Design a binder for this molecule. Structure first.
Ligand SMILES: Nc1ncnc2c1ncn2[C@@H]1O[C@H](COP(=O)(O)OP(=O)(O)OP(O)(O)=S)[C@@H](O)[C@H]1O
Ligand SMILES: Nc1ncnc2c1ncn2[C@@H]1O[C@H](COP(=O)(O)OP(=O)(O)OP(O)(O)=S)[C@@H](O)[C@H]1O
Ligand SMILES: [Mg+2]
Lengths: 37, 106, 325, 420, 373, 95
């Protein structure tokens, strides 16, 4: 929590994003929209 | 007469052109020249390459330092003492200087 | 770690690859391919109608779309719109995004000359690109609405078009009503390229086209290890005849023992070995025509004073029986 | 040319031509050769054929500097003026940018000033069109090779034209130069003549000295006893001890074989006797003389001996305090490169392991009002003084603690000079 | 005796017979075969095509076929400028020579409809120019495209040294496109076509031009690593002046210049026994295979000479002069290598051209270096 | 054939009319609303840029336009006997 953040790669987000979202979602066009937002 | 300050920076790795021309002017020119390099990098001679050092007349002169405590004491005496007569204070002023300087506990 | 590797593969030369590749891509699934092409042909009036609304049309899908775009843009649309407005037809400016040599200056220098030079826009030429297009936009807000240009951008996720200062340049073009923007991408992460700022300028719509095309032109710039063991395979075909023999004596005792360091030979005995067959006079005459094998990176040396060939166990006997013999 | 008329002035008030003045006039490096006698022909007979037959060749000579290759090829062309060519000294190091030599060539055919681009177009237009004679010296070829070899390919591709009226003469530093810098495609064009120049030998180094000492060795001067002026009241002579000239030769031929180094060590040793002669009698500047062996003993050593040992013992106390701390860390850790804060950590510790009158002064110049110093007095100063002296070396970092320090002279002589 | 050997130093080749078949449509005014002429270097290949076109132009119908040397461009414009120089005319030059499509307008002739073929000399300067798939391969790509509809086509004849260039071509271009196919190579003539040209280049024959079997001996024992026998006659022309100077003799003179000091003349370089000691001192410091300074060598020189008291320890300044005695003979080289602390700072790293096998022979004869090993 | 060269140009309803009378009529309501906020944004900057007479008069006036889309254009008053110029600095021009 204090330390400097680590480094991502792509699709590890959607690995965690699909898990923690309330099969209820599958379309990822607007999800790709908000990344470069 | 050439006066060169910080000639070591001319002695870089890449080109060294300007040193090579003036040192060859020693060898061939009818115009009498003299070159005066001043620097502080001590081993200046290894900084040169081969073809420039062979043009060089190899004579360097090291500058002295104050080697004894007594030397700069002798220097500051010659530094502060006025010898020419200008002020009435001068003869009084000269003996005040050395009296501080002669005493090692001053 | 016993791994099967691409070096341990039955390799294929240049003319052998490309010809049998050309056989498949023109005879594998030919009948269902045009059978798809006739099915999607009925969508062509639907694209014509929506494109009057200035909608940036974007084509995604698996397979290459390059042939499909050039049929749809050139032959179908561009004379159809000229006939429906009422003379040369509408100018088509393609952009080959798979070609990496696309810049922002050169293509926009084409654009302002493709578009109308009604004013001295070279006066505003002084980075003035966003400046010069801004003066183009507000003038175009008060013009009669008709398409005068359709541009095509193949492979929009291409190596130069995906650069970010080029992407925003295309964004300001798309808000203008006079030009229709029909582009295609191929990446799976293509909607990472746009935020709600650019898509506001873009108003993209999407359509699937999947014909499973081989991408003939789009394979050319790309390379793999098909495109060194194969590199020094050609230099030996043009040298002196003695270098063949001194490499033959090199390749024997270096394969006497993958081809790694340990199978290599010492420099002294190899000098004596190539002195044994009346080939090497001394070390210098050996090394000078060994630097030619070094200069084209055809042999390695590590430390005995081991010179070893960096090609595999299978490769050196292929180099034995084919080019040395 | 022009301004040498303006370089002359009038008032020359009778300069004293002493005994050793007339030596240094001929000991000037200016004015047939004994050492490279036959190799002068090997150049010339290679050159005489192409000159009198209107061809285009290449001649490649190498060697260390000081062997006459600047000199010998000038003696080749010099006699040739007696018997059709345009002589140019295209020096490599005298070109500012490497492309600037191109301007000279197009200047030295008609007299035009064009760019490096536009010159070599007309140069190429010259070298394959002219019906039928140019001598060019490409000196010091380490300069014009550096960027991408595109210049060096041109200077030998012009030689390949059978209608090219040019004769090139390359003089390099090393024979290896078209094998470790150039490509093989140039190495085909360089040919395989490759005239090697070795060093000089010590017998010939005697035979080069007396050529300068031709009319003046053991000769006589006419001297007035009042001013020290010599004329080629006494009539004195001056002799040169040949054994000291020999021991000059047996060193310079041993280390370098350099013809400037042999002349100049004699020239340096000549003026040592000059000042000692002026010391004993004082003729200023307005029975039988000689030059001892003891002069060339000093002056040859004067090429060698240093002073950094004498510099270190004549430095400040905190300078010698600094290095003694620095070798202490290098024998503590054995890592030869210590962090700067650890040295400041050590000089604190090397106090408490007269010392109090030192330790008072070492952190404040007296003064109760402004004492309590962390790092020592003038610690930036001595570390700056050791930096520009070349003894130390300190890498650049804005942190003044973890910036590393590396020694630059041998640490044993640093250990050895510390003992005094 | 001079004028017979004054003239010594100066259809004809059996490779010209190949190219007239390769130019089989060049006398019938049609588009010829597809010409990408390569070669290993020194093989006469620059003047080889120059021999053909000069024999072409002196033979040949309206006559205009031009050849330019690609050396000083780095950029594909002014080649198409130099084809305009055979016209002696005037136009708007800059746009027409820049773009691919701009070259197509340039190819409409004026006087009598003779087709034009260009000759691109020394193409490898543009091949081995700036980065491949960005500019130079594209430059290679754009030139070889001959899809023009009339038979007036800019037929390329380009040349290169190293034979990697074909695999550098894209897979579309290697599908039998343009002038790439006929990869006509020239193997280096051992003695069997080059020496016979020297025979016919001895048309004006002196009496004693030497035993020609020795000339055959010269050809056989130069053909290990060579390409230019007139230049390797230009080493005979130097030895023919040796027999003028004295009023394969010279290859024997030139190889002993190169082979020696390791076998024999190592001890010639080290007449000083201390020079033998300092030479082993360098190799003992080479255990720590590092930037071998003149100080770290001086470090191991002192710390060994205090153990074995063979001589007194000498100066660093003496250590400077003695290693330069090792330098001028050509044994050890000194270079100012890299250390990147403050600036690009130059410490001196040495390197030795001797091996321990050629060391151990010359030290067992002297048991004073035997304490030091 | 030419596809490796980049960007080569070349020079080769009863129902729908009832759409046409509806579409543009809607779009006249669109863009007229668009210039309303365009006149709104241009107004509220303009009055607030002026009339702010501070007492120290050695400070620049700053304005934070929160939530703004980085594309908000501005016009300026004429305000004679003084030139009023606009400078824009895009992070692309901030090296
Ligand atoms: N054999 C000789 N006879 C007479 N004077 C000589 C002889 N050799 C050298 N010199 C003189 O010593 C100078 C040394 O210059 P050179 O040796 O000609 O130059 P160098 O050998 O090319 O070294 P460079 O120019 O730095 S590569 C000459 O300019 C002459 O003044
Ligand atoms: N077979 C030959 N017939 C006629 N002249 C020849 C022949 N072989 C060599 N020569 C001449 O000798 C020269 C030696 O070739 P080079 O020019 O040094 O090499 P090259 O011509 O540049 O070919 P490269 O190195 O691949 S560019 C030629 O240029 C000709 O002048
Ligand atoms: Mg020269």
């Amino acid at each position: 929590r204090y330390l400097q953040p680590s480094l991502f790669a792509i699709e590890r987000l959607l690995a965690i994003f699909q898990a923690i979202f309330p099969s209820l979602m599958k379309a990822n066009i607007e999800v790709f929209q908000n990344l470069s937002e | 007469v050439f006066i060169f300050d910080e000639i070591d920076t001319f002695a870089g790795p890449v080109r060294q052109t300007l040193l090579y021309n003036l040192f060859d002017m020693v060898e061939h020119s009818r115009v009498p020249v003299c070159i005066f390099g001043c620097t502080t990098k001590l081993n200046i001679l290894e900084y040169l390459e081969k073809r420039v050092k062979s043009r060089f007349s190899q004579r360097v002169i090291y500058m002295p330092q104050i080697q004894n405590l007594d030397d700069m004491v002798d220097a500051v005496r010659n530094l502060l003492t006025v010898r020419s007569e200008i002020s009435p204070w001068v003869s009084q002023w000269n003996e005040t200087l050395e009296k501080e300087l002669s005493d090692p506990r001053s | 770690k016993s791994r099967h590797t691409m070096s341990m593969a039955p390799d294929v030369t240049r003319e052998e690859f490309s010809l049998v590749s050309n056989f498949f891509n023109e005879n594998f699934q030919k009948r269902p391919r045009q059978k798809l092409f006739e099915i999607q042909k009925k969508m062509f009036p639907q694209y014509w109608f929506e494109l009057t609304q200035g909608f940036s049309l974007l084509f995604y899908g698996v397979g290459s779309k390059r042939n499909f775009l050039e049929e749809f843009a050139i032959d179908y649309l561009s004379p159809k719109i000229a006939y429906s407005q009422l003379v040369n037809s509408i100018p088509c400016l393609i952009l080959n995004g798979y070609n990496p040599s696309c810049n922002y200056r050169d293509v926009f220098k084409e654009i302002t000359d493709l578009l109308v030079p009604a004013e001295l826009t070279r006066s505003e030429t002084k980075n003035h690109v966003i400046l010069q297009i801004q003066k183009m936009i507000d003038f175009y807000k008060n013009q009669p609405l008709d398409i005068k240009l359709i541009l095509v951008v193949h492979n929009l996720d291409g190596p130069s078009i995906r650069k970010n200062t080029f992407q925003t340049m295309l964004s300001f073009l798309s808000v203008i009503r006079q030009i229709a923007i029909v582009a295609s991408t191929d990446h799976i992460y293509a909607p990472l390229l746009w935020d709600n700022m650019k898509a506001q300028n873009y108003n993209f719509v999407f359509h699937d086209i999947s014909n499973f095309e081989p991408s003939t032109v789009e394979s050319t710039f790309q390379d793999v290890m098909k495109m060194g063991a194969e590199g020094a395979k050609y230099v030996l075909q043009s040298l002196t005849v003695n270098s063949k023999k001194m490499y033959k004596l090199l390749i024997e005792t270096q394969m006497q023992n993958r081809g790694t360091q340990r199978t290599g030979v010492e420099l002294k005995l190899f000098n004596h070995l190539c002195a044994a067959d009346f080939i090497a006079s001394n070390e210098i005459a050996l090394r000078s025509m060994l630097r030619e094998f070094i200069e084209h990176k055809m042999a390695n040396i590590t430390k005995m004073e081991i010179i070893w060939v960096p090609y595999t166990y299978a490769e050196l006997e292929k180099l034995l029986k084919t080019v040395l013999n | 040319s022009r301004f040498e008329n303006k370089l002359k002035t009038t008032q020359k008030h009778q300069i004293v031509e002493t005994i050793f003045s007339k030596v240094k006039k001929q000991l000037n490096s200016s004015y047939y050769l004994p050492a490279r006698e036959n190799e002068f022909a090997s150049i010339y007979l290679s050159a005489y054929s192409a000159i009198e037959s209107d061809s285009a060749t290449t001649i490649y000579v190498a060697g260390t500097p000081g062997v006459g290759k600047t000199l010998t090829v000038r003696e080749v062309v010099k006699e040739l003026l007696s018997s059709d060519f345009l002589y140019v000294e295209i020096n490599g190091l005298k070109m500012v940018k490497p492309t600037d030599c191109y301007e000279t060539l197009w200047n030295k055919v008609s007299g035009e000033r064009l760019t490096w681009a536009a010159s070599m177009e007309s140069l190429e237009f010259y070298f394959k069109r002219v019906p039928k004679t140019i001598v060019v010296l490409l000196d010091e070829l380490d300069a014009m090779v550096t960027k991408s070899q595109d210049i060096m390919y041109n200077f030998f591709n012009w030689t390949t034209y059978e209608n090219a009226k040019l004769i090139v003469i390359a003089v390099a530093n090393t024979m290896d130069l078209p094998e470790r810098q150039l490509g093989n495609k140039i190495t085909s064009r360089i040919g395989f003549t490759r005239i090697m120049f070795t060093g000089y030998t010590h017998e010939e180094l005697k035979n080069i000295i007396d050529l300068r000492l031709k009319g003046l060795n053991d000769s006589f001067f006419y001297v007035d006893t009042k001013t020290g002026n010599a004329i080629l009241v006494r009539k004195v002579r001056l002799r040169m001890s040949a054994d000291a000239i020999e021991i000059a030769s047996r060193k310079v031929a041993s280390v370098s074989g350099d013809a400037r180094r042999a002349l100049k060590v004699c020239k340096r040793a000549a003026e040592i006797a000059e000042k000692h002669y002026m010391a004993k009698h004082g003729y200023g500047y307005d029975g039988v003389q000689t030059v001892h062996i003891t002069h060339v003993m000093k002056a040859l050593n004067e090429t060698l001996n240093s002073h950094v040992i004498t510099f270190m013992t004549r430095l400040s106390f905190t300078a010698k305090l600094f290095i003694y701390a620095l070798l202490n860390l290098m024998k503590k850790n054995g890592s030869q490169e210590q962090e700067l804060g650890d040295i400041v950590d050590e000089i604190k510790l090397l106090i408490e392991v007269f010392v109090m009158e030192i330790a008072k002064t070492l952190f404040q110049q007296g003064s109760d009002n402004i004492s309590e110093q962390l790092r020592i007095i003038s610690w930036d100063f001595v570390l700056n003084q050791l930096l520009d002296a070349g003894i130390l070396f300190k890498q650049t970092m804005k942190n003044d603690r973890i910036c590393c320090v590396k020694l630059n002279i041998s640490v044993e002589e640093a250990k050895r000079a510390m003992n005094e | 005796k001079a004028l017979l050997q004054k003239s010594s130093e100066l259809a004809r080749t059996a490779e010209y017979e190949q190219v007239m078949n390769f130019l089989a449509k060049a006398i019938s005014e049609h588009r010829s075969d597809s010409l990408y002429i390569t070669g290993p270097p020194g093989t006469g290949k620059t003047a080889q095509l120059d021999m053909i076109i000069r024999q072409k132009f002196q033979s040949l119908e309206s006559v205009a076929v031009t050849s330019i040397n690609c050396i000083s461009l780095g950029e594909p414009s002014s080649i198409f400028q130099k084809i305009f120089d055979s016209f002696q005319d005037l136009n708007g030059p800059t746009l027409q020579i820049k773009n691919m499509q701009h070259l197509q307008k340039f190819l409409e002739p004026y006087h009598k409809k003779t087709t034009f073929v260009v000759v691109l000399d020394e193409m490898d300067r543009l091949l081995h120019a700036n980065t491949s798939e960005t500019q130079s391969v594209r430059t290679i790509l754009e030139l070889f495209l001959l899809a023009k509809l009339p038979t007036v086509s800019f037929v390329l004849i380009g040349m290169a040294n190293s034979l990697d260039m074909k695999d550098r071509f894209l897979s579309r271009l290697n599908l039998d496109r343009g002038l790439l196919p006929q990869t006509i190579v020239f193997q280096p003539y051992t003695a069997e076509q080059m020496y016979e040209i020297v025979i016919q280049k001895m048309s004006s024959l002196p009496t004693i031009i030497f035993q020609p079997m020795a000339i055959k001996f010269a050809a056989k024992k130069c053909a290990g690593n060579t390409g230019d026998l007139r230049k390797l006659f230009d080493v005979l022309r130097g030895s023919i002046e040796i027999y003028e100077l004295e009023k394969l003799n010279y290859i024997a003179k030139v190889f002993s210049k190169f082979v020696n000091n390791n076998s024999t003349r190592t001890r010639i370089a080290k007449l000083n026994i201390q020079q033998k000691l300092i030479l082993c001192t360098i190799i003992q410091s080479l255990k720590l295979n590092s930037d071998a300074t003149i100080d770290e060598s001086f470090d191991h020189y002192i710390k060994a000479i205090t153990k074995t008291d063979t001589l007194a320890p000498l100066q660093r300044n003496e250590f400077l002069e003695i290693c330069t005695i090792l330098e001028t003979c050509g044994l050890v080289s000194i270079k100012k290598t890299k250390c990147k602390g403050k600036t690009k700072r130059f410490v001196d790293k040495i390197d030795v051209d001797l091996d321990m096998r050629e060391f151990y022979d010359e030290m067992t004869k002297i048991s004073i270096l035997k304490p030091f090993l | 054939a030419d596809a490796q060269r980049s960007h080569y140009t070349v020079y080769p309803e009863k129902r729908w009319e009832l759409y046409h009378q509806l579409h543009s009529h809607f779009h006249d309501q669109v863009d007229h609303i668009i210039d309303n906020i365009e006149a709104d944004l241009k107004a509220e900057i303009s009055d607030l840029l002026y009339s702010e007479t501070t007492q120290k008069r050695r400070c620049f006036n700053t304005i934070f336009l929160l939530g703004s889309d980085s594309t908000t254009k501005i016009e300026l008053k004429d305000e004679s006997s003084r030139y009023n110029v606009l400078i824009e600095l895009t992070p692309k021009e901030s090296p």
